[PDB]
């Protein structure tokens, strides 16, 4: 979905400062040519869209859309692609219409789409185009949402956005309840190795599958093991076929990052409960079991790259070497004989990755430093250490070190001798603060990872895994998650509708080979040819018992949840079921930040900004108005003088805090003197 994406801001396109809100709006020529659900949710609403599932581009650049033409009530199969003007020429009906598989709309008054966007019950003769399918209006990432036709469009928007932000876990189990658009969207995404020509597997490994084509030739599909993606995630590809199987032309042969037996899998299936548990799941917060941490259910691998170069200078050239001035030896145990750490060393924040020193020159020394060097006999040590240290809050193993050298005849930039990259990887388990979301925009951070004992368990003794909130469901208008939860419990425990006294009433519209199903069988409700709440109601009455004669979940969908904490049963049965939830890419370790004293800016003497440097938080204008509205004058004086710009005052504050003295009086900030010099330079005498 980062390809096939329509963008509306560029050279000659509309900028945001000139953006008119009319262009933000959808209007009924997007049906089939764009997706009204999926768009960015910030200030770029409606500008950036996405292509539909079935859309196509004309040779002039107009966006086609396939329709089945119907000739006099006979819905043909001449699937004619149509552009927008030609769609306005004719009238277009809908695919969810009663058809006897002979053309022949059963209802004469059919839903239809006029040119200007009108919806009329035209008699069933003037209809000349039908839709190819339902869900033609929708994008790819939204077509993977189950029960889409029950959600509000805001929360379906948030589900379609946050389905593009899952991280690939280490197990990556396929979802129980899904749509049809997972397998096709994975085999078209290119991150699954697909067997080109049919044949028999000669040999598997973790690194290669050598296939054997039916006519003599073999071919090895090399894997891609632990590649770092562009945002620092896993990219493993384990093979799924065995040493003697047969593959066909188009068979999935290797599950990529977020796949499982070929189809897409962004999260795991989890037992859910919808009760408000003890205030920890308050205002979209989610609590979890400890089973997820213990069994590595939610565990992403994050691979970060570090690199340093060795370029020349006026004083010579920088020197990657094990010998570092003024350094100890316990930090120089990770390093090998020529700089870089060994593959497999676990480093912490602030450890040496590449021992690299520069020529410094010759400066005069302070007399205290001079006599200490005279006392301890140490020399001047004319080189200055600026080594590559793994920065704060990063740790984990060292996967691989790729070093490029000017002496090895590589393509380095001018005047750079040795370029060396280091890939540090960690295994980020789940934690509180990590953002989680289902497939319906029901997002939220992790409130508290409970131990597995004091978590509400069913009568079976199965503890639930996460506990959602009730008050997030109705007022956000997505009970698609509740229908997905009920259908998840049905597909998890399996069912067998008893067609002994005939097939029952709701099951007649239901297709065959779904009246009975094994436990943990995957099903698929597509987007608008959905599950039909009456049929789901009939399903939940007829599920099969777990291991004993024991029906945990009644016909309404609620189980008698015991309490793990105190131990008495909860006095009302509680909706439980199986739910699909993804680990989002807004984890805490990327987000946490703190700085007591770090770098400073160049022109004005303010602290810097962002987690890449240290930086401090922007104490902007609205914070200043709040501090004035309290009347707190002193704190505002501190925040605007002796924590940012009173340049003598910063070291005076540090010295007085460490020595234990009073915080001294602030002075004039440096940014005011900069403004004063600017106004003086503009020929304004500012005394």
């Amino acid at each position: 979905t980062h390809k096939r994406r329509l963008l509306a801001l560029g050279p000659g396109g509309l900028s945001r400062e000139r953006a008119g809100l009319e262009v933000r709006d959808v209007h009924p020529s997007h049906y089939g040519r764009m997706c009204p659900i999926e768009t960015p949710e910030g200030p770029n609403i409606g500008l950036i869209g996405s292509l539909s599932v079935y859309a196509r581009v004309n040779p002039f650049g107009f966006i086609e859309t396939p329709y089945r033409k119907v000739v006099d009530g006979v819905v043909s199969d001449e699937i004619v692609y149509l552009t927008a003007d030609e769609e306005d020429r004719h009238v277009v009906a809908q695919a969810n219409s009663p058809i006897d598989a002979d053309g022949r709309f059963v209802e004469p008054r059919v839903l239809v789409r006029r040119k200007a966007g009108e919806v009329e019950y035209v008699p069933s003769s003037e209809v000349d185009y039908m839709d190819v399918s339902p869900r033609q209006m929708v994008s790819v990432a939204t077509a993977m949402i189950p029960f889409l036709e029950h959600d509000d469009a805001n929360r379906a928007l948030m589900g379609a956005n946050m389905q593009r932000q899952a991280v690939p876990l280490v197990r990556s189990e396929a979802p129980l309840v899904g749509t049809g658009m997972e397998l096709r969207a994975a085999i078209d995404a290119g991150d699954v190795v697909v067997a080109e020509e049919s044949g028999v597997i000669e040999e598997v490994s973790a690194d290669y599958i050598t296939v054997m084509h039916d006519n003599g030739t073999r071919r090895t599909y090399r894997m891609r093991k632990f590649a770092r993606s562009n945002h620092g995630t896993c990219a493993n590809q384990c093979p799924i076929v065995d040493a003697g199987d047969r593959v066909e032309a188009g068979q999935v042969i290797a599950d990529g990052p977020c796949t499982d037996d070929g189809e897409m899998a962004l999260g795991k299936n989890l037992l859910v409960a919808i009760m408000p548990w003890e205030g920890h799941n308050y205002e979209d917060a989610i609590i979890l079991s400890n089973r997820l941490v213990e069994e590595d259910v939610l565990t992403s691998i994050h691979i970060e790259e570090h690199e340093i170069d060795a370029r020349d200078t006026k004083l010579g050239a920088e020197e990657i070497t094990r010998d570092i001035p003024n350094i100890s030896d316990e930090v120089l145990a990770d390093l090998d004989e020529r700089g870089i750490v060994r593959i497999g060393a676990e480093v912490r924040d602030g450890d040496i990755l590449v021992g690299k020193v520069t020529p410094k020159g010759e400066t005069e020394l302070t007399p205290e430093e001079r006599l200490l060097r005279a006392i301890f006999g140490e020399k001047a040590r004319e080189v200055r250490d600026t080594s590559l240290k793994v920065p704060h809050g990063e740790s984990g193993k060292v996967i691989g070190i790729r070093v490029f050298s000017r002496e090895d005849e590589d393509e380095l930039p001018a005047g750079v001798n040795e370029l060396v990259r280091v890939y540090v990887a960690q295994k980020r388990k789940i934690s509180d603060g990590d953002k989680l979301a289902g497939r319906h925009g029901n997002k939220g951070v992790i409130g508290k990872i409970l131990p597995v004992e004091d978590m509400p368990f069913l009568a079976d003794g199965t503890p639930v895994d996460i506990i959602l909130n009730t008050h997030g469901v109705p007022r956000r208008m997505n009970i698609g998650q509740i229908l997905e939860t009920h259908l998840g419990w049905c597909a998890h425990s399996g069912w067998k509708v008893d067609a002994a006294k005939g097939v029952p009433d709701w099951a007649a519209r239901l297709p065959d080979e779904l009246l009975e199903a094994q436990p943990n069988a995957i099903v698929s409700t597509p987007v608008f040819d959905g599950a039909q709440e009456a049929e789901l109601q009939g399903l939940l009455s007829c599920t099969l018992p777990n291991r004993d004669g024991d029906v945990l979940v009644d016909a309404d969908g609620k189980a008698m949840l015991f309490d793990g904490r105190s131990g008495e049963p909860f006095p009302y049965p509680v909706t439980v079921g199986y739910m699909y939830i993804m680990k989002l890419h807004h984890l805490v370790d990327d987000k946490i930040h703190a700085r007591s004293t770090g770098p400073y800016s160049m022109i004005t003497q303010q602290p810097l900004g962002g987690k890449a440097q240290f930086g401090g938080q922007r104490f902007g204008e609205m914070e200043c108005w709040a501090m004035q509205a309290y009347g707190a004058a002193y704190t505002l004086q501190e925040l605007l003088t002796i924590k940012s710009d009173d340049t003598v005052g910063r070291v005076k504050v540090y010295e007085a805090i460490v020595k234990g003295e009073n915080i001294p009086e602030p002075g004039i900030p440096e940014s005011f003197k900069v403004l004063l010099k600017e106004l003086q330079s503009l020929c304004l005498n500012v005394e």
């Binding site: 190819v132 969207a185 039909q532």
Partner: peptide, 27 residues
Amino acid sequence: NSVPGAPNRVSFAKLREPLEVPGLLDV
């Protein structure tokens, strides 16, 4: 099925659409 190594995901679909989903990177 339309893909030779697909897991059998039993569908609740009542319709039958003729046009299969195109080669999504065609654009």
